[PDB]
Amino acid sequence: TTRNDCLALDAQDSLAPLRQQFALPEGVIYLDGNSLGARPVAALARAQAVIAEEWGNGLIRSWNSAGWRDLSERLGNRLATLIGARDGEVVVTDTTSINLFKVLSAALRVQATRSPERRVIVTETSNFPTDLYIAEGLADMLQQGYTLRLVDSPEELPQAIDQDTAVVMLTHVNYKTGYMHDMQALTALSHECGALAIWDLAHSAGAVPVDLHQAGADYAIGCTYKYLNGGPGSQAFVWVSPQLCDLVPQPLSGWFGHSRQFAMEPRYEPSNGIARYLCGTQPITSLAMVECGLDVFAQTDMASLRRKSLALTDLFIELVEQRCAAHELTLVTPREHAKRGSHVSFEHPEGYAVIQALIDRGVIGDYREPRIMRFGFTPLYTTFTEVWDAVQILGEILDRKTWA
Amino acid sequence: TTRNDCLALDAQDSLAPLRQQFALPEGVIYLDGNSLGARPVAALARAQAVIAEEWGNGLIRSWNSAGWRDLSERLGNRLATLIGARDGEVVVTDTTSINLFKVLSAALRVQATRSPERRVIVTETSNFPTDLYIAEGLADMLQQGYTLRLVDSPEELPQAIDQDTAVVMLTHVNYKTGYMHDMQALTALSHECGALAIWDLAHSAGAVPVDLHQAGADYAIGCTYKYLNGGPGSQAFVWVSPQLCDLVPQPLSGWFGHSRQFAMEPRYEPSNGIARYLCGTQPITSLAMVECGLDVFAQTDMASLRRKSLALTDLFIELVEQRCAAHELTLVTPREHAKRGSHVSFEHPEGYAVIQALIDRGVIGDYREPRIMRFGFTPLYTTFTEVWDAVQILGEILDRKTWA
Numbered sequence: 001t002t003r004n005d006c007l008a009l010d011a012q013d014s015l016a017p018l019r020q021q022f023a024l025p026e027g028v029i030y031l032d033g034n035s036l037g038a039r040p041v042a043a044l045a046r047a048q049a050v051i052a053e054e055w056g057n058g059l060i061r062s063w064n065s066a067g068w069r070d071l072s073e074r075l076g077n078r079l080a081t082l083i084g085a086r087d088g089e090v091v092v093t094d095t096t097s098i099n100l101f102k103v104l105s106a107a108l109r110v111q112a113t114r115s116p117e118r119r120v121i122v123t124e125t126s127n128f129p130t131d132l133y134i135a136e137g138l139a140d141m142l143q144q145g146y147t148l149r150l151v152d153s154p155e156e157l158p159q160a161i162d163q164d165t166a167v168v169m170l171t172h173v174n175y176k177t178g179y180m181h182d183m184q185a186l187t188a189l190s191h192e193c194g195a196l197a198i199w200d201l202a203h204s205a206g207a208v209p210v211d212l213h214q215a216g217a218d219y220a221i222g223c224t225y226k227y228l229n230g231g232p233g234s235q236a237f238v239w240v241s242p243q244l245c246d247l248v249p250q251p252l253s254g255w256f257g258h259s260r261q262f263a264m265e266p267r268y269e270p271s272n273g274i275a276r277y278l279c280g281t282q283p284i285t286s287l288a289m290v291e292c293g294l295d296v297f298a299q300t301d302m303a304s305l306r307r308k309s310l311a312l313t314d315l316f317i318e319l320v321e322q323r324c325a326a327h328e329l330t331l332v333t334p335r336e337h338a339k340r341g342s343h344v345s346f347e348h349p350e351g352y353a354v355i356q357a358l359i360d361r362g363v364i365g366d367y368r369e370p371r372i373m374r375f376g377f378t379p380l381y382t383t384f385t386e387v388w389d390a391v392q393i394l395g396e397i398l399d400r401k402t403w404a
Numbered sequence: 405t406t407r408n409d410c411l412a413l414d415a416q417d418s419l420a421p422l423r424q425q426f427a428l429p430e431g432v433i434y435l436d437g438n439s440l441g442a443r444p445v446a447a448l449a450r451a452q453a454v455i456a457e458e459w460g461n462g463l464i465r466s467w468n469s470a471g472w473r474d475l476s477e478r479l480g481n482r483l484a485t486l487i488g489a490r491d492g493e494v495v496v497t498d499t500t501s502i503n504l505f506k507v508l509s510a511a512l513r514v515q516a517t518r519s520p521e522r523r524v525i526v527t528e529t530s531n532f533p534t535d536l537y538i539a540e541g542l543a544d545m546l547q548q549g550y551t552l553r554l555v556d557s558p559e560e561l562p563q564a565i566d567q568d569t570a571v572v573m574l575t576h577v578n579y580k581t582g583y584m585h586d587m588q589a590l591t592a593l594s595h596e597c598g599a600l601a602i603w604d605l606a607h608s609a610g611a612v613p614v615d616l617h618q619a620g621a622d623y624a625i626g627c628t629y630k631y632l633n634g635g636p637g638s639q640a641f642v643w644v645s646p647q648l649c650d651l652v653p654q655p656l657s658g659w660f661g662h663s664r665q666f667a668m669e670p671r672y673e674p675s676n677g678i679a680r681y682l683c684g685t686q687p688i689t690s691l692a693m694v695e696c697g698l699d700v701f702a703q704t705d706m707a708s709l710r711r712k713s714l715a716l717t718d719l720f721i722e723l724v725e726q727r728c729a730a731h732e733l734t735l736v737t738p739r740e741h742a743k744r745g746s747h748v749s750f751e752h753p754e755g756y757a758v759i760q761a762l763i764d765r766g767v768i769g770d771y772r773e774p775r776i777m778r779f780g781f782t783p784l785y786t787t788f789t790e791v792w793d794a795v796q797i798l799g800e801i802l803d804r805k806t807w808a
């Protein structure tokens with residue numbers, strides 16, 4: 001592959017116009033949109049309106065006159081289009097850690113009636129730390145004998161899922177390796193074994209095709225600030241299968257989840273449907289900007305984005321081997337597309353130092369322990385040519401030992 | 405009292421210059437800053453910088469290069485100055501409902517070791533609904549025999565607090581009546597009885613003098629979007645007495661509360677101190693604007709604000725009686741200052757209709773069930789003359805039966 005081949009790929013790229021809907025800083029090749037999505041141009045004006053007009057002038061009236069009262073649900077309805085969910089099934093609220101607590105609590109309470117004695121939550125050792133920590137906090141508070149089974153690889157999951165399994169809790173795309181689980185198959189296997197399946201979509205929603213209904217998933221959660229480009233710390237989302245949602249309340253039972261059809265008397269009464277997963281007053285300025293990120297996706301579809309994403313990661317892996325073969329890089333992301341998300345990770349003995357030398361030259365990925373260099377490929381605003389230019393900078397750094 | 409007396413009060417008002425630090429809409433007399441605080445002028449430019457510069461240009465780098473990593477703690481440190489807390493004791497994160505869940509869980513777990521068999525959480529029937537609902541959700545998830553004792557008036561609290569009381573959970577200023585508890589005395593009595601004391605400061609922080617250390621309080625939570633003027637749905641805060649903080653973990657154990665001195669391995673390890681009450685990634689744009697509200701308070705103190713607040717509520721009550729005596733208004737807020745917060749509530753048979761007729765004329769309070777008309781007085785940006793003008797509009801409405 002040559003630079004000219006990459007320039008041609010960009011010329012043929014039907015998604016090219018969508019890049020213009022983002023305000024990217026000059027000179028930067030941003031390969032960390034899997035950790036903080038780049039900014040849609042419209043986010044600035046949207047926030048200016050929330051602040052100056054809705055808050056500043058409307059004040060408390062804006063709960064009605066600016067639509068704030070149903071923002072979590074309208075945003076959920078938009079996001080649903082990207083994950084095989086329907087209207088009235090998704091809300092955007094709180095954070096991924098919090099939402100996981102809500103659905104894991106709901107799942108264990110469903111299984112306490114259905115199948116008591118089931119006490120194990122199966123997951124992976126390399127799961128995103130907060131998912132582990134939240135599951136550990138919940139189990140520690142409940143007692144007992146709720147315990148966590150950490151499995152050291154994806155292939156060991158089937159033997160760890162058995163009659164003792166209350167819940168299988170997995171992040172669909174591994175935050176370190178970029179390995180992608182087969183959602184439908186691991187869900188079917190969880191159900192076969194009697195367990196409910198909870199999927200963290202942080203590295204999936206807006207990155208790869210997801211269809212929660214088709215997969216038979218029970219609960220899901222994820223972030224809007226990564227591939228969905230919602231802004232820094234923008235609120236997470238939660239989806240619950242209509243089969244399960246109204247069976248039990250979730251424990252973070254704040255007033256926004258109270259039924260809207262009856263007055264707020266001393267006794268909590270949950271809303272029918274997903275609105276029961278609402279809790280408290282949401283940071284509105286940050287919440288409103290989620291819309292700007294979602295709006296860009298409306299101009300294409302996840303099949304088209306998946307296609308460009310695979311072309312970008314294929315190109316990155318190929319170019320790194322082509323240009324940097326004579327250095328000590330080890331691919332940790334699967335070569336096989338069905339097991340691949342939208343990022344690529346290489347290990348390197350001085351991976352931290354190389355990542356910082358790259359950042360020092362405007363090529364921004366990130367470092368994960370141990371020794372992993374992670375690069376996210378975001379087809380909405382990443383070009384093929386900038387992949388070439390990024391690898392050339394990496395090659396220059398490695399050849400010159402700039403990292404030292 | 406006359407309008408000219410009010411004009412003179414404004415001329416003598418040493419706090420008058422602080423009003424100019426808020427961008428208020430023309431023609432509005434805003435008496436709902438106890439529900440959504442008015443906008444500091446600086447909030448717009450602050451958000452513009454977060455969006456355009458920190459997010460848009462800095463991207464993921466801003467976790468370091470814009471201070472995002474310690475924002476919750478720096479904001480907590482600022483807020484601490486207003487509630488008798490010290491550095492390293494307060495964080496601004498999540499919402500009041502969520503934070504209450506964190507501290508109530510911590511309190512019950514402390515009491516499960518200290519004094520098992522204690523199973524009652526005492527509170528009031530007229531407590532803000534979400535506080536009740538969160539306590540109900542937690543008790544319902546734990547089991548058992550955790551139960552809630554709802555007390556129908558402030559004077560009935562002493563007899564409800566006994567040897568069975570794990571926790572006394574109270575909102576310091578009643579959201580409906582504006583009645584203010586004696587924090588120090590009810591805390592002392594809770595401790596005398598063996599209970600821990602949790603105080604919701606939603607209608608207290610930034611409104612009345614608070615000193616959590618002097619009061620001997622165990623845990624506290626509150627909002628930044630009311631009297632602290634942080635913006636719509638701006639994040640809540642939580643304080644924990646240093647005596648208790650490190651005794652147990654709180655159950656919403658997300659990664660931001662992990663110790664910063666050690667790597668993020670599979671096992672959660674809480675930070676020493678208040679940082680353990682952090683959980684997940686916070687909505688940064690909304691969080692940053694909390695600073696603008698806190699900054700105004702730095703230019704005065706809570707004694708001075710308390711003084712002007714009492715002068716405003718005294719004036720409102722007096723003017724309403726002076727001008728509206730011949731109508732069916734019933735004062736529900738205590739006349740006695742030591743039992744009074746910073747708002748005034750009147751009951752009226754058609755209270756809802758009167759509140760909307762007032763809103764229709766730009767005088768904005770709110771309606772609480774049943775039949776309560778609530779008006780918040782915010783000395784940072786409320787003038788004495790606008791109190792006069794508001795009452796004159798109320799008088800015109802009542803005389804003409806405009807509410808019909």
Ligand SMILES: *Cc1c(COP(=O)(O)O)cnc(C)c1O
Pocket residue numbers: 254279280281499500501502532534535575579604606607627640
């Ligand atoms: C305003 C208020 C709340 C708000 O709760 P959120 O979870 O922030 O919506 C809670 N409790 C009390 C007493 C309040 O006054």
Ligand SMILES: *Cc1c(COP(=O)(O)O)cnc(C)c1O
Pocket residue numbers: 095096097098128130131171175200202203223236658683684685
């Ligand atoms: C990004 C990410 C999170 C973030 O959690 P917050 O509570 O939003 O900070 C959680 N889990 C996974 C798998 C992630 O990729």
Ligand SMILES: [Cl-]
Pocket residue numbers: 034035175
């Ligand atoms: Cl990540």
Ligand SMILES: [Cl-]
Pocket residue numbers: 438439579
């Ligand atoms: Cl309120």
